[PDB]
Design a protein around this ligand. Sequence first.
Ligand SMILES: O=C(O)CNC(=O)C(=O)O
Ligand SMILES: [Mg+2]
Ligand code: NI
Ligand SMILES: [Zn+2]
Length: 331
Amino acid sequence: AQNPNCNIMIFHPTKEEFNDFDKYIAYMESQGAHRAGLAKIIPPKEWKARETYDNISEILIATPLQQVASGRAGVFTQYHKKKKAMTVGEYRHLANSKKYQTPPHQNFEDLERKYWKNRIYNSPIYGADISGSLFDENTKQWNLGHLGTIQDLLEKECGVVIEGVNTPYLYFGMWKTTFAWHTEDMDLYSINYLHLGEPKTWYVVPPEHGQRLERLARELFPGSSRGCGAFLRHKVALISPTVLKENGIPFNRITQEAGEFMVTFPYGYHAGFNHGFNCAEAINFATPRWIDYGKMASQCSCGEARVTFSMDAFVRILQPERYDLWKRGQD
Ligand SMILES: O=C(O)CNC(=O)C(=O)O
Ligand SMILES: [Mg+2]
Ligand code: NI
Ligand SMILES: [Zn+2]
């Protein structure tokens, strides 16, 4: 078995190997990359996502989210308070203000220590979940707006044509902005490209050990667990690496820098934080190997998780027994 310790693997494809996206994902999996739940892909030196980022300031962040924490430094939840709209140029100036800017630090490890010590005492503002793309239309390789759609993959594997579309999302971050512990909708893959700015640190649990993380979460968030049998779908819970280590939960960590891709694999729980002002683009995708994970994915039916239009068909076809209850949650 390849990669039996479930380490995060880093890949350096050549420009020739960067042509065929599906084939390269399959290659990474042949080397055991999926066992980690997360892989890094460094593009060939010939490749670029677009020519420059000099003209992005007028993009609108319609609903910036202030991420307010509750709990203790290593075990907390966050809620999202909606703020007034602002442009990317306004948000960058805010990120760089004395109130929000990254503190002085020695290296990524020192900054990680400061994040876990101090995150709860601040409320950073995240420009998350903005439909759109920063890839140039002429970028032919690993263009996250030109991938094969999940609806087409389901149709190719299973023969059933379904409604829905699959488009990318932009994330504008600042110091301490946080993504809570989660797997993707319907335990899909994700791919994330860090277009510009400061790094993003990731934590990940191997898919084979995801249920260990879920059992810890039920212990640590006992009211949330009584409320919902899949409350990590709410995407609000944070647990620090120190707490994971104290409870014996297998996990790994890695820092993504500008110009790098990350791929998350089906049922790979992940969480993390931004180091300073940045912009990432991400989208979900599927392969043949995903189908069995989609059929088994947990679902929130309490009403909190509320998701996209296109998830309806995935539940309806892959999980017909659950469909009625899940849809009640959505309505
Ligand atoms: O970048 C973020 O805030 C969160 N991203 C992801 O969870 C992802 O790409 O799967
Ligand atoms: Mg602009
Ligand atoms: Ni994710
Ligand atoms: Zn729920």
